[PDB]
Each structure stands twice: as structure tokens, then as C-alpha cells.
């Protein structure tokens with residue numbers, strides 16, 4: 001059994017193993033860092049099955065849960081939030097914060113999302129690039145999602161820049177372990193003060209709704225409100241930054257699709273759909289243990305065995321998406337959902353928000369900067385390390 005996680009074939013590519021597995025051994029065992037085995041599921045139909053089967057559990061205290069690193073094993077000891085819950089606990093807690101993220105709520109947030117993108121783009125223009133390239137990640141891909149989720153949580157405008165930097169430090173490849181852990185606990189300490197403040201005087205933000213609707217009636221405690229707020233911050237922010245940067249690189253890589261998007265910004269939603277299929281920035285979250293025996297394809301997954309369902313692989317499944325390794329914004333979509341945001345009851349709470357942020361970015365960026373260019377050769381883009389989820393660390397641009 002091969003070691004898992006697998007490394008990407010190159011900067012912008014999935015691991016090479018998945019295509020071969022889909023063709024010749026779609027449900028197979030892999031070896032995790034601790035020597036334990038897990039079942040790896042690679043076909044779209046089977047990933048959806050894993051995502052939805054009530055015979056499977058997300059609870060990390062079940063033996064056989066496929067932790068992929070030493071750090072994950074240690075994080076499993078903590079009081080879980082809804083990301084690691086099964087029904088009925090899962091929706092009992094998730095429903096406390098889903099209102100801000102519904103399709104209708106996100107449609108009403110569109111003018112705010114647009115303003116945030118417009119202001120950061122105008123910022124960038126004022127900075128200018130007269131003295132040379134600027135980093136699109138630091139100047140734009142990082143602050144767009146950061147400012148939005150912090151604002152929705154309740155952070156005031158003057159604190160956004162500092163906290164945006166600190167949250168980046170938590171996941172920056174270059175941070176030492178100490179630096180990332182200090183940033184982590186710093187964010188937590190900050191959120192704990194906001195919860196104290198919003199309990200005494202609520203405002204129009206997610207933390208206030210938690211305080212008023214859940215903490216004060218005793219449904220959860222202050223510490224739970226902090227952890228829920230924290231989960232909303234850290235679960236998706238790095239994914240958003242990576243998807244923005246990857247989208248700019250992808251357009252540069254396929255000039256006539258960029259030309260189409262510039263000529264017709266109304267194409268941004270379909271560009272974003274293709275982007276979230278082709279670049280599956282979160283490929284390791286659909287994990288389970290079997291509560292009881294379950295058959296998947298030609299395999300028996302026994303009780304207390306772990307399962308990893310690769311949505312990245314599913315998004316390249318030739319049986320579902322014709323010419324899956326082709327980036328095509330004009331893709332003819334099948335009835336089966338792309339799985340960039342997962343599937344089933346745990347499907348990304350923020351899927352609609354994330355797509356709206358991305359659509360806003362890709363319908364505005366090249367109207368603002370029609371001559372935006374990556375300022376290094378595309379082959380020299382600094383991607384995340386190959387043993388991680390796909391992403392971009394920094395992206396020099398001119399405009």
C-alpha cells in the first residue's frame with residue numbers, strides 16, 4: 001500500500017496516482033503516516049456515497065479515523081465543533097450559523113462583497129507598480145476573503161489588517177511551529193474578547209447572533225461560541241486565497257479564455273465553476289470511519305476502518321466530466337455536481353459565499369486591470385509544496 005497523502009505531479013497538477021486508480025483500482029488501501037491503513041475512494045459516484053452514507057462517521061475519537069499527520073492526531077483530542085460531528089449534533093450546531101450563508105443571504109451580501117473587492121483593487125491601483133511588481137496574494141487574494149469573513153464575524157474595520165496578517169501566519173509555509181501556534185492562540189484570544197463584548201452589547205455580526213441566540217439561553221457556552229467563530233474563520237480562508245491566485249494563474253495559462261472573460265465578464269460564474277472543479281484546493285476533508293461494514297464497489301470496508309474520499313479525483317472523473325483534465329470555462333456540465341465544496345450534509349457551509357466572492361473577483365479584476373499580467377514566467381510560479389493541497393504562495397503581477 002502506498003503512502004498517502006500523495007504529492008502533486010507538479011505545481012498546478014493533481015497527484016498522478018488518482019487517474020491510474022480510477023482506471024484500475026478505484027477503491028484501494030493506502031498507508032498513513034502512522035502505519036495504519038485507510039481506504040481511498042477515487043470515483044465520483046463513490047465519493048458521493050462516502051459523503052452521504054449514514055453508516056459512516058466524522059467523529060475523530062473513533063479508532064480508525066484517518067488522521068493524515070501527527071498534528072491532526074493531536075487536534076482530534078479537542079472538543080469538536082460541527083465539522084467533526086455526526087447527526088443530530090452536526091446540524092444542531094451548524095444551524096446556529098448557517099443563516100448568514102444561505103443563497104438568499106449571500107445574494108443580499110453581493111453589494112458588500114463588490115465594495116470590498118472594489119476598494120482593495122483601488123488600493124492596489126494607488127499603490128501602483130511603477131517601481132516593479134506587486135504580490136497579488138498579499139495585496140488582493142489574501143485580504144478579499146479575510147476582510148469579508150472577519151467583518152461578517154464582527155471584527156471592526158481598524159483591526160482587519162493586523163488580524164489578516166496573523167491568520168496568514170497560522171498557515172504560511174514559512175512560519176515556524178511556534179509562530180503559527182502563537183498566531184493561532186492570539187486569534188482565539190481576540191475572538192474571546194469580541195464574545196465578551198457582544199454579550200454585553202450585541203451588534204450586526206455572527207458572534208453577536210451566537211451570543212444572543214445560543215450563549216445567553218445556555219445552548220452553548222462562551223468558549224463554544226469562540227470555537228465556532230474560529231472554525232468559520234480558519235476553515236475556508238486559505239482555500240479562498242488559493243482559489244483566487246490559482247484562477248489568475250489559470251487565466252494566464254490559457255490566454256484565449258482570459259480574452260473571453262475580459263470580453264464578457266458575465267462568464268465569471270462559469271469560469272468559477274470550472275475553477276473549483278479543476279483546482280480542488282481542499283482535497284482531504286472528506287474522511288470517515290465505518291461504523292459498521294459497508295460495501296463500496298468491489299471492496300468491503302469493515303467496521304472501524306477509515307476512508308478518504310478524494311473530491312479532487314472525483315472532479316477529474318472521466319466518466320462524469322468529459323476531457324476532465326482540460327480547463328474549459330465553456331464546459332458543458334453534466335447533471336452530477338462538481339465536488340470542490342464536498343457533498344452531503346457536511347458540504348461547505350460557505351459554498352455560496354465562496355462562489356460569490358470568486359465570481360465578484362473574476363468579473364471585476366480584469367475590468368479594473370485589463371492588462372494585468374503575471375510578472376514572472378508561468379513555469380516559475382511559486383506553488384504550495386507538492387505534498388500539500390494545491391495553491392499559490394505568492395504571485396508577482398503588473399498592471
Ligand code: HEM
Nearest residue numbers: 083232235236239240282285341342343346347348350354
Ligand atoms: C473556495 C473556497 C472554499 C473551498 C474550496 C472550500 C471547501 C470545502 C470542502 C471541500 C469542505 C468539506 C465539505 C464536506 O465535508 O463534504 C468544506 C467544509 C467547510 N467549509 Fe469550506 N471551502 C471554501 C471556503 C469556505 C469559507 C469562506 C468558509 C467560511 C466562511 C468555509 C467554511 C467551511 C466549514 C465551516 C466547513 C465544514 C462544514 C461541515 O462539516 O458541516 N469554507 N469547505
